Amino acid sequence: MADQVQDMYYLSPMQEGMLFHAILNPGQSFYLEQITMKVKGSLNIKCLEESMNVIMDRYDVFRTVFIHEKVKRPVQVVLKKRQFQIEEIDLTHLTGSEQTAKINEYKEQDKIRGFDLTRDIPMRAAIFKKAEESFEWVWSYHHIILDGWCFGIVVQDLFKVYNALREQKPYSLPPVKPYKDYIKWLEKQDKQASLRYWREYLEDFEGQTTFAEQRKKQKDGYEPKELLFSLPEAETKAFTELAKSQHTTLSTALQAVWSVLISRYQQSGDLAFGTVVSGRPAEIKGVEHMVGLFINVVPRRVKLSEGITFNDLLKQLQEQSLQSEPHQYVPLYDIQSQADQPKLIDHIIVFENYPLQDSENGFDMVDVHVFEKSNYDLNLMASPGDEMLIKLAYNENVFDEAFILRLKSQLLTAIQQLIQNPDQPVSTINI
């Protein structure tokens, strides 16, 4: 009802693409993030639920629903108020194995259910009580309203409010600019110019099947496996110092190392891979604190000339990052149409924190597992820390475990060698 509506506005191109595929592929876990937290301690579910309702009121995207039927163009509608409820389930009368079964049953049905974006709050939570001070919290949300960085903001706020309610002390949260300001910014962007930026960037790129000689083609479907390792502290510090000394980021430096490795396997100096970009335009005041969907997967195309050094590559990538910033809102589908290559990239490199990791909150998160549908057969996911954390997540029906172990070995030695000689040709790095 109009009286219940706060606001209405169009979708970002990325949101619009997600709504389209979400509607067209119900039941397939598209765009669903499901986090399972094992919790030990005196979690107060009522307090957590009050905290979640402060978050609901604070960030318009949680009160947003989507309309696609009987309209010229989809719209997102912000409701003035929506009450969040945590589903509380008591499993204390079940055996351990029976508890695991009930929780896995919930998680599997949750993936299939997804969200009805025309009516549901695009976030939900179930908390299973397994014993006194023993819980599992399954937190689900849809990426059409929230990317990872924005999720981190929400987590921070949620636990700031929870802890103030627990300590029975006043609190405040700083003002936030609403997500509609990003939608307004998009209005001012020349969409054809952004398509042209990508068309020119990808001009004359010839396709690439990455690690073609290692790809198996036998077993059907995705068999998800992961290899986790850490870069030692000394190397992590030196790699971080190197990135900063070249006025770039850890993420760009990791992409640069990867480029060297890909160039060898592809026997080519023109290569591409997927990268996650923030999508937060600097000209938007306070964008870094907004909550919504900004982060995008875009192609990175790297060109290695004879003699190119690692510091040369850092400069190349850093400059391209800056040039791409106004155009990071373009969906990958539209980008890849500008190259006439629907499979232009076939793996991704992601550098990110996770705000939930395994005192203050009165309880411990003893385990955290994240489910997200996998769109590529290989994904390199790194996270900052005293030891940089690197995860190679892959489809074992395509890549052998032995090959992923070889990539780990090659990554580690390449990083070590490039730290030591960032001003020699990268062709001299032994892998």
Numbering used by the authors: 5 to 362, 369 to 441
Copy text verbatim from the article accompanying this structure deposition.
Nonribosomal peptides (NRPs) represent a valuable source of clinical therapeutics. These natural products are biosynthesized by multifunctional enzymatic assembly lines, called nonribosomal peptide synthetases (NRPSs), that use dedicated modules to incorporate each building block selectively and sequentially into the peptide scaffold. NRPS modules typically possess three core domains, which perform substrate selection and activation (adenylation or A domains), shuttling of activated substrates (thiolation or T domains, also called peptide carrier proteins, PCP or CP domains) and peptide bond formation (condensation or C domains), respectively. The enzymatic assembly line that produces the microbial lipopeptide antibiotic surfactin, surfactin synthetase, consists of the following three proteins: trimodular SrfA-A, trimodular SrfA-B and monomodular SrfA-C. The modules are composed of several functional domains, including C, A and T domains. In the current study, we re-engineered the donor substrate specificity of the SrfA-C C domain (green) to enable direct acylation of the acceptor Leu (residue 7, yellow highlight) with a fatty acid rather than an amino acid.
We also undertook crystallization of the C domain covalently fused to the upstream donor complex, the 10-undecynoyl-NH-ppant-T domain, but crystals of the didomain did not grow. However, we also solved the high-resolution structures of wild-type SrfA-C, and comparison with SrfA-CFA structures provides insight into the origins of the specificity shift. Although the terminal C domain in surfactin synthetase is known to tolerate some changes in its native peptide substrate, we sought to expand its substrate scope to nonpeptidyl acyl donors. To first test whether SrfA-C has any latent activity with inherently less reactive fatty acids, we examined its ability to process 10-undecynoic acid, which contains a terminal alkyne for bioorthogonal labeling. Although activity was detected, the fatty acid was processed >15 times more slowly than O-propargyl-Tyr. The lipid substrate of RzmA-Cs sits deep within a pocket in the N-terminal lobe of the C domain, and comparison of the structures suggested that expansion of the SrfA-C substrate pocket between the core β-sheet in the N-terminal lobe and the fourth α-helix, close to the active site, might improve 10-undecynoic acid recognition. We therefore prepared a large combinatorial library in which hydrophobic (Ile39, Met41, Trp143, Tyr145, Phe155 and Val159) and negatively charged (Glu37) residues lining this site were simultaneously randomized using degenerate codons that code for small and hydrophobic amino acids. Structure-based considerations would certainly have included mutation of Glu37 to a smaller residue, as the side chain of Glu37 blocks the fatty acid pocket in all crystal structures.
